[PDB]
Amino acid sequence: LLIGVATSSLALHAPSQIVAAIKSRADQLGASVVVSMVERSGVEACKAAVHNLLAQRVSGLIINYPLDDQDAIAVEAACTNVPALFLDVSDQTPINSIIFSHEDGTRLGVEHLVALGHQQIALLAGPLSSVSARLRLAGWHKYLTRNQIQPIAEREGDWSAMSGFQQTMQMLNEGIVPTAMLVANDQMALGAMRAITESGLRVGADISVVGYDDTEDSSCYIPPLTTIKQDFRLLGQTSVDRLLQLSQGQAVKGNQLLPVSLVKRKTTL
C-alpha cells in the first residue's frame, strides 16, 4: 500500500500520464504512490532514485525509466528484495517487466505507410541511449526491410517537441523530403509537424507523420496526429495490480507485453 515510482523526466508527457495512470489504479485499491524523478540519464541516476524511494519505505517499486539490459539488472539488484517492476526495458531482460509491444507498434506504423503507398520514409528516433528508442528504431528497420524499403533519412531527437523541430528542419535543409515520417513519440511529431508546415508543406498531403504514444494533446495537434496508441491507463492498472501480486508473492515473474494500436487521424494520407 505504498508504491514508489521512479520515473524519467516528467517534462515528457508519456511519463506524466503513466504516473497519473499508476496513481489512479493505486487510488482504486487504497494504495499510496510516491514519485521520485530520475536525474537525467544513467544507471547511477536511476539507482539514486530507487534509494530515495526505499528511503520512504515503499513496499513496491515501479521503475519507468529506460534501462539497458545490464543496467536494468544492476537496478533490480539494488531494489534488494522489495518488489520491482520495470516499464522501460527490452522484453529480453530477465527481470519483472511490463512493456508495450514494439514489434506491433513499429509494424503498424510501417505497414500503414506502406499501405498508403509511401516509399520515401524518414525515421525520427528517440535518443538512442534509451532502450525503448532503440527497440522502436530496430522495429522500423525490421518492417521496412521486410517491405524492401530503406529509409531516406534517420535522425535522432531527445523526445521533446523542439528536437523534432530541429531534426526535421535539418533533414529538410539537407534536401531530404520524405513523403512520410515515422516518429518515435508524439512530442517530437509535434515539432516535426511544425518543421513541415513552416517549410511550406502540408502535413499529410506533402509529408505524412506517424507519432508514437497517443499522448493526450495528440488529438488536437494541427492536424490531429495519426499515431501508435500505447494505453498508459492500461499500463498503470496493469503494473499496479502486478506489483501488488508481487508483494503477495504469487505473481507472474518475467516480462509481459501489452498490445498497442494505430490511431488513424489526419496527418497520414
Amino acid found at 50: V
Query: From the CB of 99, what's the least distance to ligand IPT, in Å?
Result: 7
CB atoms within 10 A of CB 24: 14
Phi, psi of 79 (to 5 degrees): -75, 0
Sign of the CA dihedral with 190 first, then 192, 197, and 198 last: positive
66 binds, among ligand IPT, a copy of itself, none (CB under 5 to 8 A by kind): ligand IPT
Q: Which is nearer to a copy of itself, 136 or 265 (CB)?
A: 265
Amino acid found at 185: N
Query: From the CB of 169, what's the least distance to a copy of itself, in Å?
Result: 11
Query: From the CB of 190, what's the least distance to a copy of itself, in Å?
Result: 5
Cell of 32: 499510496
- DSSP characters for 149-178? ---SEEEE--SSHHHHHHHHHHHHHTT---
C-alpha distance from residue 159 to each of 63, 78, 177 (Å): 19, 28, 21
Query: From the CB of 249, what's the least distance to ligand IPT, in Å?
Result: 26
10 binds, among ligand IPT, a copy of itself, none (CB under 5 to 8 A by kind): a copy of itself
Query: From the CB of 185, what's the least distance to ligand IPT, in Å?
Result: 3
Q: Which is nearer to a copy of itself, 88 or 102 (CB)?
A: 88
Q: Which is nearer to a copy of itself, 83 or 191 (CB)?
A: 191
Do the Cβ atoms of 198 and 164 come closer than 8 Å? no
Q: Which is nearer to a copy of itself, 32 or 145 (CB)?
A: 32
Q: In the complex, which residues of this chain contact ligand IPT (CB under 6 A)?
A: 8, 12, 14-15, 64, 66, 87-88, 130, 132, 159, 185, 212-213
Give the position of cell 520514409: 121
Question: In 3-state terms, what secondary structure has residue 60?
Answer: strand
132 binds, among a copy of itself, ligand IPT, none (CB under 5 to 8 A by kind): ligand IPT
